[PDB]
DNA sequence: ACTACGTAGT
DNA sequence: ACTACGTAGT
């Protein structure tokens, strides 16, 4: 697994299945929206995220993206509960301090497009109608990359 | 979807994922063990089955295979119930009379191998320890095809 | 064992 | 809506 640009993967490239992102090293998980690793000194850091309408996120053609954390049963669900600051959610949070590039794959209505590298600027806790905590991650697209239309 | 041999697919060919069987027209479903269609006169007929240890089936190097029907919660399960003679289970049963070739894909411990064409000779009802009905399909490998080792 | 922004078909 | 002999990762 790598952090940042993946060789042979261009901004704007389109993919049919999630497993292609696995083979090409873009996004290893099969379902999980967030992928991560441990760096020099076992601290979780995000490497790639996928926003395909599975949660609350609505994507516009801006440079700033709001990404919802995983868990708490929101989307394909089961009774609601608090989200946890572990694994992918934790990794995205640590990526704020480490200032590492995070790949972003957007789902299109074949089905996936690589939109380039982003930086996790911050995060916070929201309390939806459930009565439970959800995480929101504010990511900004690193300037210089090719633009993509929608 | 086709009945019988698929062009470019040889007996002994190996595949990594189920979706390859979908693309090459070997086995369209993503999880379901049985694939089927309606022929001239809307009667369900099986086209391909997959035996990858998901149920009770144990495969030897014989020409006769015993295939368990789907449903009734057996394998990845949820309370037990009777299996139903619908869809794939029904299609395999009708394939007995229609005497049509049925493709067989065996799972290996990359992960899938095409073992050739089979004929559904018969079927019957078993009553497991659940107290519920399960279907058993007796298939025989059509003579003449290349042999495969295990 | 459990999770998980999957995936096709009916 | 529901099903389903999936699939990777922890
Ligand atoms: Mg909001
Ligand atoms: Mg028996
Ligand atoms: Mg669908
Ligand atoms: Mg149906
Ligand atoms: Mg596994
Ligand atoms: Mg874990």
Residue numbers in the entry:
A (entry chain A), B (entry chain A): 362 to 438, 442 to 473, 484 to 524
What does the paper say about this structure?
In Arabidopsis, the SRA domain of the SU(VAR)3-9 HOMOLOG (SUVH) histone methyltransferase recognizes 5 mC (mC) in different sequence contexts and methylation statuses. The recognition of methylated DNA is required for the maintenance of the repressive marks 5 mC and histone H3 lysine dimethylation (H3K9me2), and for silencing the transposable elements and gene transcription in plants. SUVH5 is unusual among the SRA domain proteins, as its SRA domain efficiently binds methylated and hydroxymethylated CG DNA, as well both the hemi- and fully modification statuses.
To understand the molecular mechanisms of SUVH5 SRA-mediated recognition of fully-5 hmCG DNA, we determined the crystal structure of SUVH5 SRA in a complex with a self-complementary 10-base pair duplex containing centrally located 5 hmC-G pairs with a 3′ “T” overhang. The biological assembly of the complex, two SRA molecules bound to duplex DNA, is generated by the crystallographic two-fold axis perpendicular to the DNA helical-axis. The symmetrical 5 hmC bases from the adjacent base pairs are flipped out and positioned in the binding pocket of individual SRA molecules. Gln392, located on the thumb loop (connects α1-helix and β2-strand), inserts into the minor groove and substitutes for the flipped out 5 hmC in the duplex DNA. In addition, Gln392 forms intermolecular hydrogen bonds with the Watson-Crick edge of the orphan guanine and stacking interactions with the flanking bases, thereby compensating for the extrusion of the 5 hmC bases from the DNA double helix. The flipped out 5 hmCs are tightly positioned in the pocket via parallel-displaced π-stacking interactions with Tyr416 and Tyr428, and by intermolecular hydrogen bonds between its Watson-Crick edge and the side chain of Asp418. Our structural analysis revealed that the flipped-out 5 hmC adopts a similar conformation in the binding pocket and has a similar distribution of intermolecular interactions as that of the flipped-out 5 mC in the crystal structure of the SUVH5 SRA-fully-5 mCG complex. 5 hmC binding induces a conformational change in the pocket, and the wall region (Gly414-Asp418) is reorganized to accommodate bases larger than 5 mC.
